[model samples]
Target: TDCSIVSFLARLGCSSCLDYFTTQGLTTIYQIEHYSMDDLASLKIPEQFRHAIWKGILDHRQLHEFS
Candidate 1:
């Protein structure tokens, strides 16, 4: 039930982003959150998608902080 990372990224219309994570062995939010902007750029992730992921990470962190 915690597979929202894939779904969320997919909803953003960037299947390539999902493929990037999959091929790089990053299957979880934790893994994705650890990647820096430069790391994402190294993978050629578009700036918009990178911003989306960063926002998602911040949202996830805020949710967890309250719980």
Candidate 2:
């Protein structure tokens, strides 16, 4: 089950990464893909949490058009 953004923010260490994405109007990972890796890196997410967010972007992208 997908959690609310605030729930995820509290559970996941990269809360600011999600926050930054939310501020960028990115409610989906397709938006993340539109951003360059350089742009992603610019978010200054803590190193440990970067991969989780990156993977989350991919995982969410994969599910974007699902019913």
Candidate 3:
């Protein structure tokens, strides 16, 4: 199990889904910046928003990874 953070936006809600306990095993923005499409398949996240959320996730990753 992992701790979670919640936000009130539609995109953020799906972003949070990346951290949800996987049907197979354990599992954020920062929580899921590494989540590939295949990983979302594992989580059963919406096919639609999976694309949307990953954009934001990579955006956050880019911001943080900036030196």
Candidate 4:
């Protein structure tokens, strides 16, 4: 499930995922596929950003990895 951070982003929010890509100086899915948590962390996307993103993914796939 942790294959690619950008892929996770895509599964979470399509438009938002693209925005993240653009903001990070990425313009293609290949670039996103190469992104990692460390890269996202460097963006200073906010602390709760991870939790929020995870929540979105959980809700989308109906997965309850965390309570």
Candidate 5:
């Protein structure tokens, strides 16, 4: 599973999303998934990106059991 953050975000139509998070040393889905809402908020993600990410998370939840 090549679940890199750039690939995931690019799937959501944010091809440049990696540029935003790379500064924080977050380069993988595992790292991005661990980010708190507050942390995401602090990044000032646009509404569309935020929505895409949330939807992606939910979609992923449906594909895997989290607990």
Candidate 6:
């Protein structure tokens, strides 16, 4: 559950992709981590959004690394 914009998906500014991941059953960040690329492919995530999601994931990790 994303309680704030700091969550990676929200930070990506791809609301539809984020909402799709939620309603499509990747309901939590932990879930996504467990099955990332393959699951996203299964869900047929577009290459465009995929890039953003990947970038967001790294950005969040980088932030977490310091804090």
lDDT of 5 at 32: 65
Candidate 6: tens digits of C-alpha lDDT, residues 1-67: 3333236566677666765675675665545644455566677777778767766655555565676
Which of candidates 5 and 6 reaches a greater TM-score? 5
Estimate the TM-score for candidate 2: 0.50
Task: Estimate every model's Cα lDDT from 0 to 1.
Answer: 0.69, 0.59, 0.54, 0.50, 0.68, 0.60
Model 5 lDDT on a 0 to 1 scale:
0.68
Segments of candidate 5 deviating more than 4 angstroms: none
Measure candidate 3: CA RMSD: 4.7
Pairs that collide, model 3 = 28-31, 28-32
The candidate with the higher lDDT, 4 or 5, is 5
Which model, 1 or 5, shows the larger lDDT?
1
Each model's total of backbone clashes: 0, 0, 2, 0, 0, 0
Q: What TM-score would you give candidate 4 relative to the actual structure?
A: 0.39
**Segments in model 4 whose C-alpha atoms lie over 4 Å from true places:** 1-10, 14-18, 51-67
> Distance from true position, residue 64, model 6, in Å?
2.4
Using lDDT as the measure, what is the rank order of every candidate, best first?
Answer: 1, 5, 6, 2, 3, 4
1-67 per-residue lDDT for model 3 (tens digits):
2233344124365644544434335432345657787876667776776676567556666777773
Clashes of 6: 0
User: After superposing candidate 3, which stretches have Cα over 4 Å from the reference?
Assistant: 1-5, 8-28
User: Mind sharing the TM-score for model 3?
Assistant: 0.57
Reference-based TM-score of each model: 0.68, 0.50, 0.57, 0.39, 0.70, 0.58
Structure candidate 1, residue pairs in collision? none
Candidate 1 local Cα displacement, residue 42, angstroms? 3.1
Instruction: Supply the global lDDT for candidate 6.
Output: 0.60
* Cα distance off (Å), candidate 2, residue 33: 5.1
Q: What tens digits encode model 2's per-residue C-alpha lDDT throughout 1-67?
A: 3445544445555566677667756564444554544566777656776777666655555665463
